[PDB]
């Protein structure tokens, strides 16, 4: 690659000088009306945040909007390890490492920071690495440093505790037989309203043996045979003109004693078919969910 | 060579002895020559005169005194000894048979004891028990004084400034005069004793025409006080008395077994009860006792009593009349009405630390007081005219509680020899730890942060990270302790528009009631000031406009930053991120021989080899006789020139020796024979550092260029050309010992000559026991011969037959020496044997 | 990957069988010696060390499958009986 | 506040009228056709208010989709399958009236 | 119970070897782990090979950059032969080292033409060459290579353990227990808990079956349960076991 | 319906007391129960069926 | 081999009688000097067996060659010592 | 797999899965005895068969920093055309899109 | 709840670029340690 650094590999976006413009107008008239008397000091605590915090997203957006057109293997960063690589822009599209946030602090400005409280300092910080924080500046940036290594240290102690619940019941919950002995009547018929009001989706539907014959509208021969499987592309002609009851074999519908066969459950998900016998469905399920 | 020099901003002062804060508080605790009367004598005022009264005992202090050690200096490094002095102490006992010291004749009178023993302070400021050098840091906690919180619920009260009054003495008493309306008006004591408040006020004399008769007309709150004295509709007066007109006898009704009666009652709460022949049985808790006083003399609790309070009555309350009852509760009205005196809980100004010397004085005292739980049983022992001499005071009861303070507490810790520069910043730190009423593991947000008085104060910066972030800190540059506790921070002063070049040392308990502007502030000429909105700060609190208001400046800009994250290059492009895993990562240095000055700095690494005490310093002019590199000896022109008779002060230069963290700590001469050094001058650079600057690491050169994969996640490939130099090369050195015993069998010894069957144990061990130094071998050898006979020198017959085919030699005594543990070899540094020296080795 | 391995769990409907049939089995041949395998030794793993080849693994006997057969106590029963297996020295 | 009983359904006998906190955001507007067992309000709901009515059909639906809700927002994928096997162990128990 | 006491020093000399880390002051973490050898090292145009290889993967989530006026300006201090005063929040500046560049050997950006050892075909678009002010931080010894086989065991616990010359097992804790279930496996997980623990009698046997190339039997029953049975027997409570 | 169960989790003081009066036969049928005793796993790869 | 199902019944005097074989009375635990527990004492062997392998407290069988004999002064058998 | 050091080399697609970085982390190494878990090393417990999530559907193994550096290289083209012509002589530029 | 594993290893981790998506690296040394009553069965059976 040949990717490098260098003292004029840290160009500045021109368009900076463009989003300001129109902040320094408003700041041009936050001070103004503060000596008359008409505007209080808490009045204008929380006005300054509704216009910085939303002029240093911008600048990174326009950027990446160049470096995109006539050049694009343009190199930039500095000179240290981690996980990220030269070409801020190449590696932040590639998809590898590097959020508009961490990028902003290299080729933009510094933004906002916040109290020990939890207010928000008043005069911002565009005073970039580049051409050296103040002092008084650097007093502040020391403030909302503070917030990143405190509210991650709840998730690395111990997410485990909802899985910590689930195995120490369904450890029984495990696949018994292939078929049972039910019907094709008494067992679950999933509406299509549910959820909070009637927001639908084909995530129940994913992967499931239908139970009775569906008879859906449209020509003949259109019926769905009572002993098929279901995958992604069968489920959407489902719920596109049906609308209505659908019979399909559940979990909850299972006629046996401590366990569900394979017909019952669906997909394995792990790989591309039916569930095999043996499938700890009740062990699986609890780290399913436990470990997002 | 020029110097292009650019930045200057010249100050006015420098920055003062990063070691003065552990220096000078010690040295006043012991009191030996310089002062008569103070630190240590206010230690004996404490537990004498110690009284046992059990008849006519009686026994008082008089003066103490500071001798000999115990034996020499040198020989308490190699045993385990805490090298300290003993005190002497006079005591006047007298008999029941009238036997005072006072007299020539029947009168006995002892003036020299030596029982305790504290450690002492030299050079630098480390003490030194066991061996291992102990340094105590000092902490931070919030001090002790009237504050003003809040209280949840409620929403229908009374009380001070908000709701319940909460003060803080140390453990007199929590004095609550709350107000609860209903019925029974709601006042505690000491814990939660539970009683009406309407007998309390008669009992000060106040008659039912004083406290709801001339304040119940600004307030109907008093739904509490209008209960016992039962004040419905007008009726009759006279004849019609309950508990609040009468005082003396008081109205006799009530639901229960006792009744109640003011005055005599507030004793009744205790079952059973008792005759009131002791009308001091609690109140003399609240008046002449350490109760009230939380210092010496209110020498703390004068700014926090005065100041919001009215103003004082003696060093507690008194007798009958209690004056601390009524400047109270005149306060919980006071703001009631509208005045203004909120106390912040963050706040620099009210928590002070308490350092060494301070430190010294609450465990000595505990120490001391300690014995007198023993001279009172040795008392019952005591015949007649023998329990006057040191038959009573004990030396290890005292000597007890001070040495489990030097080296088992959370303020004793190991200092960190990893580096020469990490050693003066461990000790310039102050953890938040230390007691359970001072420091709780509460959710504290807006406490675990940096506040923006932090700022000359405490470094936002050098803070260790991790789950103790906020606690544990670091002090600045120009941020010095006095003798009170709070950190003083220079500050220039001003008066509308001029400006005084002179600074102003102010604690933080003035610098929020006071304006401090900014230093990077435009200003033409002391005379007028060039802007109308200056940029300056409140108490945790941005302000803006007016120059009139402001009467302070910043002197200096690098009064944030700490001591040791100043070193490093470029600091305004480097993220507080960064900056801190820079700092906390070089305080794990080590020093190597290819030790070299960056090619940049800041000009401060040369302040710290200096105030840290590595390198040598001349204390005198001479020319130098030797330059060895192991000793160095300087003779100085205070005697005629005689071969035997001169100023001979030989410097031990310490050659490759032990450590707290196995590290390498050496000196290399970089002063030549003959050439006349005087004061100041530098006789041997320290371990790592060149000329006495910096030099932790060095500097190499870099193709900055990924390397196909192999460098994935933090991984680097170095050249081989390195390690051809062998530049880095770190001694870390063990510990290896051999002890003999007193084994049923027989005492084994230690010779050259072993009746070994080998010739492998005997090729080491020649020296007559010892062997030379300097060698080679590998992991599993014999470091010193042993010679322990097993078996009661009888071979058994079963066992004669395994050796017999594998030839038959079996030897009494076998080779039993100590073999070296897994992992990694090394040479020796220093052989030291005590064969029974006539010393006192124990 | 590795040598026939996928191919096994393509061939039956399921997974979870192919564990035993190279479990239960190849655990008892080295306990009952060698003999017991009276397949060809077309069917054996190959091992590179020394222009040689070792050792045996398995994988490679999964052909002939049934349904019904032996409960699961004998396995281990009559094994252990026909042959006794140990280690001597001389 | 507004008083009745939770949105009280007018039958053709008696109705019924409780009390509950103004501290409730409405949901369900006029003019709907509504059951017991429902959902009236927002958020979670009681398992042994609705068991009354739902059944197990029903009350197993909902348990298994409102998890399926706070997974949603997130952006993390996962089968509702998953849930319907653990929440059938709570239907292995059933009192006697 | 002792006649004299002799000590002995053991100094070592520990050289650099590929596990320890290094980071210099501005917090560049990092490892060694192959050492590249001088034949397949790229040099520059007088030839010289480059004292060591970093690596330019990581750096907008640093936001530290600030070392770039110490590996310029020190190469520019170099080839002019002076030492650079620079107090903080101040000091030099873009346009006063820029100027300062322009004397030094040649360059002026930094960025030389580097050739390539390996193929000979220079690099495309050069790259910097600078001095970089690192540190090699100690080498803890809680990261040392450690591995056990065999030990010593209790009595009534009869367990692993881990004594001086001998190494210590890795604990088999819970949270690797659940994971294994879920696969739904078996003999994998009744071994860590039997055998390799417990299980005492189950244990020589199994080491006597490996020796001779054969395989281990089955497991018997764990002594933390054959012992719970007595421990409950104490207790007013009688328990028997019982087949089929 | 086993006695083990609940003794391998929550409040097992109490069910060692409820199935020694009335003699519970508790068979290897769950999963825990069987890690405290040692046997091959009753399900997953070795099961019934 | 292997595990089936397990049964559980209340503790009865008449059957705890069987397993033991006498009472203890003396509190005194063992002896410092010859290392003996102390007879009908917490320690003893005359009820808990013995505490070395094939031979009693006192002395009167020690060679292997007494595979198991009880003793007529002692009055404990003799095993190895597993059965403790 | 033998290789001359005292460190545990561990693959860089895979590292998706244990979240952990090179920068001085540590990892535990457990050795089956029994045959019989052998095998399930090499049928569930092996990373070749285990490519999709369990919980979604999706592949969890994809191509981190450099491994897709490569490919986002070789795969670039300029994009910005004009429209549509004859185009047989003058501009061949590279390998624009 | 936790039983010691009787055969277990643990060191620093690195990269291995020759390494395939189915392998891992391990230390030299320490694969005498682990299988260590596995490397004496088979060195009884061949010469060494």
């Given at each position: 690659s040949g990717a490098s650094v260098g003292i004029d590999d840290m160009v500045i976006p021109e368009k900076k000088h463009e989003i300001i413009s129109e902040a320094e107008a408003e700041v041009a008239e936050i001070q103004e009306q503060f000596q008359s008397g008409l505007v209080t000091a808490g009045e204008r605590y929380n006005k300054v945040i509704d216009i910085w915090a939303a002029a240093n997203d911008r600048v990174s957006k326009a950027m990446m909007d160049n470096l995109?057109?006539?050049?694009?293997?343009n190199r930039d960063g500095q000179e240290e390890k981690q996980v990220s690589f030269n070409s801020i822009y190449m590696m932040a599209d590639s998809g590898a490492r590097g959020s508009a946030a961490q990028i902003r602090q290299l080729a933009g400005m510094r933004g906002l920071m916040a109290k020990p409280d939890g207010s928000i300092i008043e005069?911002?910080?565009?005073?970039?690495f580049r051409e050296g924080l103040n002092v008084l500046q650097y007093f502040i940036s020391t403030h909302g440093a503070r917030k990143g290594l405190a509210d991650t240290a709840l998730k690395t102690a111990n997410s485990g505790y909802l899985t910590r619940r689930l195995v120490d019941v369904a450890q029984?919950?495990?696949?018994?037989?292939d078929d049972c002995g039910?019907?094709?009547?008494?067992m679950m018929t999933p509406v299509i309203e549910g959820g909070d009001v009637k927001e639908p989706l084909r995530d129940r539907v994913l992967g499931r043996v239908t139970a009775e014959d569906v008879l859906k509208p449209?020509?003949?021969?259109?019926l769905v045979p009572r002993n098929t499987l279901l995958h992604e592309q069968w489920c959407d002609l489902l719920e596109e003109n049906s609308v209505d009851a659908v019979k399909v074999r559940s979990v909850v519908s299972c006629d046996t004693d401590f366990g569900v066969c394979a017909h019952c459950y669906g997909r394995?998900?792990?790989?591309?078919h039916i569930i095999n016998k043996g499938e700890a469905i009740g062990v699986i399920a609890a780290q399913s969910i436990g470990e997002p | 060579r020029i110097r292009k020099d650019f930045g200057k901003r010249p100050q006015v002062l420098d920055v003062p002895y990063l070691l003065s804060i552990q220096l000078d508080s010690f040295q006043?605790?012991?009191?030996?020559?310089?002062?008569?009367?103070?630190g240590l004598e206010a230690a004996f005022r404490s537990v004498?005169?110690?009284?046992?009264?059990?008849?006519n005992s009686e026994l008082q202090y008089v003066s103490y005194r500071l001798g000999e050690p115990?034996?020499?200096?040198?020989?308490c490094q190699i045993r385990g000894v805490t090298y300290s002095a003993p005190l002497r102490v006079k005591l006047r006992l007298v008999i029941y048979?009238?036997?005072?010291?006072?007299?020539?004749?029947?009168d006995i009178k002892e003036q020299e004891v030596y029982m305790g023993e504290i450690p002492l302070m030299t050079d630098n400021g480390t003490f030194v028990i066991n061996g291992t050098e102990r340094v105590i840091v000092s902490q931070l906690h919030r001090s002790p004084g009237v504050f003003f919180d809040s209280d949840k619920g409620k929403t229908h009260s009374s009380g001070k400034v908000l709701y319940n009054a909460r003060i803080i003495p140390y453990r007199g008493s929590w004095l609550d005069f709350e107000f609860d309306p209903k019925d029974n008006l709601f006042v505690r004591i000491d814990r939660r004793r539970k009683?009406?408040?309407?007998?309390i006020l008669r009992a000060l004399?106040?008659?039912?025409?004083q406290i709801l008769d001339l304040f119940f007309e600004k307030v109907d709150l008093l739904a509490k006080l209008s209960q016992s004295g039962h004040?419905?509709?007008?009726?009759?007066?006279?004849?019609?008395?309950?508990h609040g007109p009468?005082?003396?006898?008081?109205l006799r009704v009530d639901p229960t077994n006792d009744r109640l009666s003011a005055l005599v009652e507030i004793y009744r709460m205790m079952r059973p009860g008792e005759p009131?022949?002791?009308?001091?049985a609690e109140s003399?808790?609240?008046?002449?006792?350490f109760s009230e006083d939380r210092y010496d003399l209110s020498a703390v609790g004068r700014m926090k009593f005065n100041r919001s309070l009215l103003r004082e009555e003696i060093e507690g309350s008194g007798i009958l009349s209690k004056d601390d009852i009524i400047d109270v509760m005149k306060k919980l009205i006071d703001i009631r009405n509208g005045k203004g005196e909120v106390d912040d809980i963050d706040h620099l100004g009210n928590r002070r630390i308490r350092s060494v010397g301070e430190m010294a004085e609450n465990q000595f005292r505990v120490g001391l007081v300690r014995v007198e739980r023993a001279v009172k049983e040795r008392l019952s022992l005591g015949d007649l005219?023998?329990?006057?001499?040191?038959?009573?005071?004990?030396?290890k009861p005292i000597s007890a509680a001070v040495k489990e303070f030097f080296g088992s507490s959370q303020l004793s810790q190991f200092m960190d020899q990893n580096n020469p520069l990490s050693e003066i910043t461990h000790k310039r730190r102050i953890s938040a730890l230390g007691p359970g009423g001072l420091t709780r593991?509460?959710?504290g947000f807006e406490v675990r942060d940096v506040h923006p008085?932090?700022?000359?104060?405490?470094?936002?910066?050098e803070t260790p990270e991790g789950p103790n972030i906020g606690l544990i800190n670091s002090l600045s540059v120009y941020a010095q302790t006095n003798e009170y506790g709070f950190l003083e921070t220079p500050y220039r002063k001003v008066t509308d528009g001029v400006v005084t070049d002179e600074i102003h040392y102010l604690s933080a308990i003035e610098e929020g009631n006071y304006v401090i502007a900014q230093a990077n502030s435009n200003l033409d000429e002391?005379?007028?000031?060039?802007?109308?909105l200056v940029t300056c700060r409140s108490k945790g609190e941005s302000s803006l406009f007016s120059?009139?208001?402001?009467d302070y400046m910043d002197?200096?800009?690098?009064?944030?930053?700490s001591v040791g994250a100043s070193?490093?290059?470029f600091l305004e492009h480097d993220d507080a991120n960064r900056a801190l895993m820079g700092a906390n990562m070089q305080r794990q240095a080590v020093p190597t021989l290819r030790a070299d000055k960056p090619l940049?700095?800041?000009?401060?690494e040369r302040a710290v080899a200096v105030d840290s005490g590595v390198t040598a310093v001349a204390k005198r002019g001479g020319v130098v006789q030797y330059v060895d590199a192991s000793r160095i000896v300087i003779k100085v022109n205070?005697?005629?020139?005689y071969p035997g008779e001169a100023g001979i002060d030989i410097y031990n230069?310490?050659?490759y020796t032990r450590s707290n963290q196995n590290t390498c700590i050496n000196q290399m001469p970089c002063v030549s024979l003959g050439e006349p050094v005087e004061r100041g001058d530098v006789l041997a650079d320290g371990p790592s550092t060149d000329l006495g600057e910096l030099a932790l690491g060095q500097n190499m050169r870099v193709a900055f260029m990924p390397w196909?994969?192999?460098?994935?996640?933090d991984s680097i490939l170095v050249s081989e050309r390195v390690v051809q130099e062998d530049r880095f090369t770190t001694i870390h050195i063990q510990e290896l010992a051999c002890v003999s015993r007193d084994t049923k069998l027989g005492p084994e010894e230690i010779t050259a000559?072993?009746?070994?069957?080998?010739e492998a144990a005997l090729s080491k061990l020649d020296e007559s026991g010892i062997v030379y130094i300097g060698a080679e071998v590998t992991g599993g050898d014999i470091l010193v011969g042993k010679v322990t006979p097993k078996g009661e020198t009888q071979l058994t017959p079963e066992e004669k037959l395994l050796r017999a085919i594998f030839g038959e030699k079996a030897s009494d005594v076998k080779d039993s020496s100590l073999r070296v543990p897994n992992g990694v070899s090394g040479t020796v540094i220093d052989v030291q044997v005590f064969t029974r020296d006539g010393v006192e080795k124990d | 990957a590795r040598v026939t391995v996928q191919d096994a769990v393509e061939k039956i409907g399921n997974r979870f069988d192919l564990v035993l049939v190279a479990a239960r089995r190849a655990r008892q041949m080295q306990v009952g010696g060698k003999?017991?395998?009276?397949?060809?030794?077309?069917?054996k793993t190959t091992v590179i060390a020394l222009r040689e080849i070792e050792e045996g693994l398995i994988n490679?006997?999964?052909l002939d499958v049934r349904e019904r057969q032996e409960q699961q106590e004998q396995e281990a029963a009559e094994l252990q009986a026909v042959t006794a297996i140990a280690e001597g020295r001389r | 506040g507004k008083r009745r009983l939770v949105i009280t359904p007018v039958d053709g006998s008696d109705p019924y009228e409780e009390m509950i906190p103004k501290w409730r955001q409405l949901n369900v507007f006029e003019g709907e056709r509504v059951e017991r067992?429902?959902?009236?309000?927002?958020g979670p709901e009681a398992p042994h208010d609705i068991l009354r009515l739902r059944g197990v059909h029903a009350v197993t639906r909902y348990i298994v989709n409102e998890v399926q809700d706070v997974y949603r927002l997130q952006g993390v994928k996962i089968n509702d399958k998953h849930i319907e096997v653990i929440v059938?162990?709570?239907?292995r128990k059933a009192t006697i009236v | 119970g002792v006649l004299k006491i002799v000590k002995v020093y053991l100094a070592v000399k520990r050289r650099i070897q590929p596990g320890d880390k290094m980071a210099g002051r501005h917090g560049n973490k990092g490892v060694i782990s192959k050492i590249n050898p001088i034949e397949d090292m790229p040099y520059d145009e007088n030839g010289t090979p480059v004292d060591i290889v970093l690596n330019p993967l990581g750096v907008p989530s640093r936001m530290?950059?600030?070392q770039i006026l110490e590996t310029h300006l020190g190469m520019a201090a170099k080839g002019i032969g002076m030492p650079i005063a620079t107090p903080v929040f101040?000091?030099?500046?873009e346009a006063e080292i820029k100027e300062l560049l322009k004397?030094?050997?040649?360059?002026?950006?930094?960025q030389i033409r580097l050739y390539d050892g390996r193929t000979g075909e220079q690099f495309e678009r050069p790259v910097t060459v600078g001095y970089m002010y690192m540190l090699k931080l100690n080498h803890l010894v809680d990261d040392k290579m450690h591995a056990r086989s065999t030990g010593s065991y209790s009595l009534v616990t009869q367990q692993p353990l881990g004594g001086k010359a001998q190494f210590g097992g890795q604990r088999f804790g819970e949270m690797e227990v659940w994971a294994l279930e879920a696969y739904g496996a078996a003999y994998t997980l009744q071994e860590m808990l039997t055998?390799?623990?417990?299980?005492v009698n189950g244990r020589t046997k199994m080491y006597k079956n490996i020796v001779d190339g054969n395989h281990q039997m089955e497991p018997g029953m764990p002594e933390s349960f054959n012992v719970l049975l007595k421990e409950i027997r104490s207790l007013g409570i009688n328990i028997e076991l019982e087949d089929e | 319906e086993s006695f083990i169960s609940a003794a391998s989790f929550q409040e097992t003081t109490r069910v060692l007391t409820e199935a020694a009066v009335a003699g519970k036969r508790d068979?290897?049928?769950?999963?825990k129960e069987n890690v405290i005793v040692g046997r091959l796993i009753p399900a997953g790869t070795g099961y019934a069926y | 081999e292997e595990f089936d199902a397990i049964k559980i019944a209340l503790a009865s005097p008449d059957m705890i009688r069987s397993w033991s074989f006498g009472e203890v009375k003396k509190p005194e635990t063992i002896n410092?000097?010859?290392?003996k527990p102390e007879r009908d004492?917490?320690?003893?062997?005359?009820?808990?067996?013995?505490?070395?392998?094939?031979?009693?407290?006192?002395?009167?069988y020690k060679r292997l060659k007494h595979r198991g004999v009880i003793c007529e002064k002692c009055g404990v058998e003799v095993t190895q010592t597993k059965v403790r | 797999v033998l290789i001359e050091g005292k460190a545990i080399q561990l693959h860089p697609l895979v590292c998706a899965a244990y979240?952990?970085?090179?920068?001085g982390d540590q990892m535990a190494v457990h050795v089956p005895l029994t045959l019989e878990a052998q095998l399930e090393a090499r049928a569930l417990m092996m990373s070749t068969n285990n490519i999709?999530?369990?919980?979604?559907?999706?592949?969890?193994?994809v191509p981190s920093q450099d491994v897709v550096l490569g490919l986002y290289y070789m795969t670039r083209d300029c994009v910005n055309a004009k429209g549509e012509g004859m185009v047989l002589t003058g501009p061949k530029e590279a390998e624009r899109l | 709840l936790g039983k010691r594993v009787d055969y277990s290893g643990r060191s620093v981790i690195t990269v291995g670029p020759?390494?395939?998506?189915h392998q891992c690296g391990l230390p030299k040394k320490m694969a005498l340690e682990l299988f260590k009553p596995f490397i004496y069965g088979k060195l009884e059976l061949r010469g060494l």
């Amino acid at each position: 690659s040949g990717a490098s650094v260098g003292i004029d590999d840290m160009v500045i976006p021109e368009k900076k000088h463009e989003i300001i413009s129109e902040a320094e107008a408003e700041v041009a008239e936050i001070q103004e009306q503060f000596q008359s008397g008409l505007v209080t000091a808490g009045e204008r605590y929380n006005k300054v945040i509704d216009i910085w915090a939303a002029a240093n997203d911008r600048v990174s957006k326009a950027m990446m909007d160049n470096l995109q057109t006539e050049t694009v293997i343009n190199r930039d960063g500095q000179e240290e390890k981690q996980v990220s690589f030269n070409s801020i822009y190449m590696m932040a599209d590639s998809g590898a490492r590097g959020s508009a946030a961490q990028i902003r602090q290299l080729a933009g400005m510094r933004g906002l920071m916040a109290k020990p409280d939890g207010s928000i300092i008043e005069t911002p910080i565009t005073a970039n690495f580049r051409e050296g924080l103040n002092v008084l500046q650097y007093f502040i940036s020391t403030h909302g440093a503070r917030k990143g290594l405190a509210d991650t240290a709840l998730k690395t102690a111990n997410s485990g505790y909802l899985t910590r619940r689930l195995v120490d019941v369904a450890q029984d919950l495990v696949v018994t037989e292939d078929d049972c002995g039910t019907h094709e009547g008494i067992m679950m018929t999933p509406v299509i309203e549910g959820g909070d009001v009637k927001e639908p989706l084909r995530d129940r539907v994913l992967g499931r043996v239908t139970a009775e014959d569906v008879l859906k509208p449209g020509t003949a021969d259109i019926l769905v045979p009572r002993n098929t499987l279901l995958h992604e592309q069968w489920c959407d002609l489902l719920e596109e003109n049906s609308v209505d009851a659908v019979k399909v074999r559940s979990v909850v519908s299972c006629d046996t004693d401590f366990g569900v066969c394979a017909h019952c459950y669906g997909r394995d998900l792990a790989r591309g078919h039916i569930i095999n016998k043996g499938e700890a469905i009740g062990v699986i399920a609890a780290q399913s969910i436990g470990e997002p | 060579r020029i110097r292009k020099d650019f930045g200057k901003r010249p100050q006015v002062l420098d920055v003062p002895y990063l070691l003065s804060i552990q220096l000078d508080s010690f040295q006043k605790f012991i009191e030996q020559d310089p002062e008569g009367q103070y630190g240590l004598e206010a230690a004996f005022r404490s537990v004498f005169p110690i009284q046992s009264y059990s008849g006519n005992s009686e026994l008082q202090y008089v003066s103490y005194r500071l001798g000999e050690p115990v034996f020499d200096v040198q020989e308490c490094q190699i045993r385990g000894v805490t090298y300290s002095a003993p005190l002497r102490v006079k005591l006047r006992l007298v008999i029941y048979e009238r036997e005072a010291p006072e007299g020539t004749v029947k009168d006995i009178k002892e003036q020299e004891v030596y029982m305790g023993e504290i450690p002492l302070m030299t050079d630098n400021g480390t003490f030194v028990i066991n061996g291992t050098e102990r340094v105590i840091v000092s902490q931070l906690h919030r001090s002790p004084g009237v504050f003003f919180d809040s209280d949840k619920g409620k929403t229908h009260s009374s009380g001070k400034v908000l709701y319940n009054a909460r003060i803080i003495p140390y453990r007199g008493s929590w004095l609550d005069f709350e107000f609860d309306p209903k019925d029974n008006l709601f006042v505690r004591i000491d814990r939660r004793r539970k009683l009406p408040a309407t007998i309390i006020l008669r009992a000060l004399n106040y008659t039912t025409e004083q406290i709801l008769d001339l304040f119940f007309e600004k307030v109907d709150l008093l739904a509490k006080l209008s209960q016992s004295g039962h004040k419905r509709i007008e009726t009759l007066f006279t004849n019609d008395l309950d508990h609040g007109p009468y005082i003396s006898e008081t109205l006799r009704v009530d639901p229960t077994n006792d009744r109640l009666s003011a005055l005599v009652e507030i004793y009744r709460m205790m079952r059973p009860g008792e005759p009131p022949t002791r009308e001091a049985a609690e109140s003399l808790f609240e008046n002449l006792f350490f109760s009230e006083d939380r210092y010496d003399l209110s020498a703390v609790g004068r700014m926090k009593f005065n100041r919001s309070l009215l103003r004082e009555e003696i060093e507690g309350s008194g007798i009958l009349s209690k004056d601390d009852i009524i400047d109270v509760m005149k306060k919980l009205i006071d703001i009631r009405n509208g005045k203004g005196e909120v106390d912040d809980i963050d706040h620099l100004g009210n928590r002070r630390i308490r350092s060494v010397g301070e430190m010294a004085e609450n465990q000595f005292r505990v120490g001391l007081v300690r014995v007198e739980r023993a001279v009172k049983e040795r008392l019952s022992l005591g015949d007649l005219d023998t329990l006057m001499p040191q038959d009573m005071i004990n030396a290890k009861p005292i000597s007890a509680a001070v040495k489990e303070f030097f080296g088992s507490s959370q303020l004793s810790q190991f200092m960190d020899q990893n580096n020469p520069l990490s050693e003066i910043t461990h000790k310039r730190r102050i953890s938040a730890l230390g007691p359970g009423g001072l420091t709780r593991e509460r959710a504290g947000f807006e406490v675990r942060d940096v506040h923006p008085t932090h700022y000359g104060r405490v470094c936002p910066i050098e803070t260790p990270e991790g789950p103790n972030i906020g606690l544990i800190n670091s002090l600045s540059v120009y941020a010095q302790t006095n003798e009170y506790g709070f950190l003083e921070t220079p500050y220039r002063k001003v008066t509308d528009g001029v400006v005084t070049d002179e600074i102003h040392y102010l604690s933080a308990i003035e610098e929020g009631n006071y304006v401090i502007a900014q230093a990077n502030s435009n200003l033409d000429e002391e005379g007028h000031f060039v802007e109308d909105l200056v940029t300056c700060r409140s108490k945790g609190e941005s302000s803006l406009f007016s120059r009139d208001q402001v009467d302070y400046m910043d002197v200096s800009t690098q009064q944030v930053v700490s001591v040791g994250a100043s070193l490093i290059p470029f600091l305004e492009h480097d993220d507080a991120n960064r900056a801190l895993m820079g700092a906390n990562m070089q305080r794990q240095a080590v020093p190597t021989l290819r030790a070299d000055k960056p090619l940049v700095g800041t000009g401060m690494e040369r302040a710290v080899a200096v105030d840290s005490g590595v390198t040598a310093v001349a204390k005198r002019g001479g020319v130098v006789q030797y330059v060895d590199a192991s000793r160095i000896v300087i003779k100085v022109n205070e005697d005629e020139m005689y071969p035997g008779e001169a100023g001979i002060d030989i410097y031990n230069l310490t050659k490759y020796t032990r450590s707290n963290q196995n590290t390498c700590i050496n000196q290399m001469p970089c002063v030549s024979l003959g050439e006349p050094v005087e004061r100041g001058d530098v006789l041997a650079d320290g371990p790592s550092t060149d000329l006495g600057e910096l030099a932790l690491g060095q500097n190499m050169r870099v193709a900055f260029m990924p390397w196909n994969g192999y460098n994935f996640e933090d991984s680097i490939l170095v050249s081989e050309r390195v390690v051809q130099e062998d530049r880095f090369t770190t001694i870390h050195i063990q510990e290896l010992a051999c002890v003999s015993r007193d084994t049923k069998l027989g005492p084994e010894e230690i010779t050259a000559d072993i009746p070994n069957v080998g010739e492998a144990a005997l090729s080491k061990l020649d020296e007559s026991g010892i062997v030379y130094i300097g060698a080679e071998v590998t992991g599993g050898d014999i470091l010193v011969g042993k010679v322990t006979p097993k078996g009661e020198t009888q071979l058994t017959p079963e066992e004669k037959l395994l050796r017999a085919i594998f030839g038959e030699k079996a030897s009494d005594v076998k080779d039993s020496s100590l073999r070296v543990p897994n992992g990694v070899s090394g040479t020796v540094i220093d052989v030291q044997v005590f064969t029974r020296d006539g010393v006192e080795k124990d | 990957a590795r040598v026939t391995v996928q191919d096994a769990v393509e061939k039956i409907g399921n997974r979870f069988d192919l564990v035993l049939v190279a479990a239960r089995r190849a655990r008892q041949m080295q306990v009952g010696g060698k003999d017991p395998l009276v397949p060809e030794e077309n069917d054996k793993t190959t091992v590179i060390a020394l222009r040689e080849i070792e050792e045996g693994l398995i994988n490679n006997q999964i052909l002939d499958v049934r349904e019904r057969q032996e409960q699961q106590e004998q396995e281990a029963a009559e094994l252990q009986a026909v042959t006794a297996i140990a280690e001597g020295r001389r | 506040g507004k008083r009745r009983l939770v949105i009280t359904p007018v039958d053709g006998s008696d109705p019924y009228e409780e009390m509950i906190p103004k501290w409730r955001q409405l949901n369900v507007f006029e003019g709907e056709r509504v059951e017991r067992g429902d959902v009236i309000s927002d958020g979670p709901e009681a398992p042994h208010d609705i068991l009354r009515l739902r059944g197990v059909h029903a009350v197993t639906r909902y348990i298994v989709n409102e998890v399926q809700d706070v997974y949603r927002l997130q952006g993390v994928k996962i089968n509702d399958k998953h849930i319907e096997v653990i929440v059938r162990q709570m239907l292995r128990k059933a009192t006697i009236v | 119970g002792v006649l004299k006491i002799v000590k002995v020093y053991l100094a070592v000399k520990r050289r650099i070897q590929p596990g320890d880390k290094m980071a210099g002051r501005h917090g560049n973490k990092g490892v060694i782990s192959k050492i590249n050898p001088i034949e397949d090292m790229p040099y520059d145009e007088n030839g010289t090979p480059v004292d060591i290889v970093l690596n330019p993967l990581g750096v907008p989530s640093r936001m530290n950059i600030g070392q770039i006026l110490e590996t310029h300006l020190g190469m520019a201090a170099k080839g002019i032969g002076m030492p650079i005063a620079t107090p903080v929040f101040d000091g030099a500046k873009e346009a006063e080292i820029k100027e300062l560049l322009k004397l030094g050997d040649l360059p002026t950006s930094g960025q030389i033409r580097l050739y390539d050892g390996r193929t000979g075909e220079q690099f495309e678009r050069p790259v910097t060459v600078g001095y970089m002010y690192m540190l090699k931080l100690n080498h803890l010894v809680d990261d040392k290579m450690h591995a056990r086989s065999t030990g010593s065991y209790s009595l009534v616990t009869q367990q692993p353990l881990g004594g001086k010359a001998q190494f210590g097992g890795q604990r088999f804790g819970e949270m690797e227990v659940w994971a294994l279930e879920a696969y739904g496996a078996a003999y994998t997980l009744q071994e860590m808990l039997t055998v390799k623990s417990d299980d005492v009698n189950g244990r020589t046997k199994m080491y006597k079956n490996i020796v001779d190339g054969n395989h281990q039997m089955e497991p018997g029953m764990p002594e933390s349960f054959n012992v719970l049975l007595k421990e409950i027997r104490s207790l007013g409570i009688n328990i028997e076991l019982e087949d089929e | 319906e086993s006695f083990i169960s609940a003794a391998s989790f929550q409040e097992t003081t109490r069910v060692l007391t409820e199935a020694a009066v009335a003699g519970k036969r508790d068979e290897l049928r769950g999963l825990k129960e069987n890690v405290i005793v040692g046997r091959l796993i009753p399900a997953g790869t070795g099961y019934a069926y | 081999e292997e595990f089936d199902a397990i049964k559980i019944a209340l503790a009865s005097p008449d059957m705890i009688r069987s397993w033991s074989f006498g009472e203890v009375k003396k509190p005194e635990t063992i002896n410092y000097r010859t290392f003996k527990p102390e007879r009908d004492g917490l320690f003893c062997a005359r009820i808990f067996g013995p505490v070395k392998d094939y031979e009693c407290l006192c002395g009167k069988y020690k060679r292997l060659k007494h595979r198991g004999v009880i003793c007529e002064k002692c009055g404990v058998e003799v095993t190895q010592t597993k059965v403790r | 797999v033998l290789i001359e050091g005292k460190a545990i080399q561990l693959h860089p697609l895979v590292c998706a899965a244990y979240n952990a970085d090179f920068d001085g982390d540590q990892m535990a190494v457990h050795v089956p005895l029994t045959l019989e878990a052998q095998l399930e090393a090499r049928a569930l417990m092996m990373s070749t068969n285990n490519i999709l999530s369990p919980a979604n559907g999706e592949p969890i193994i994809v191509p981190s920093q450099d491994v897709v550096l490569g490919l986002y290289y070789m795969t670039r083209d300029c994009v910005n055309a004009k429209g549509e012509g004859m185009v047989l002589t003058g501009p061949k530029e590279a390998e624009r899109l | 709840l936790g039983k010691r594993v009787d055969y277990s290893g643990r060191s620093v981790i690195t990269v291995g670029p020759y390494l395939r998506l189915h392998q891992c690296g391990l230390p030299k040394k320490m694969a005498l340690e682990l299988f260590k009553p596995f490397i004496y069965g088979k060195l009884e059976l061949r010469g060494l």
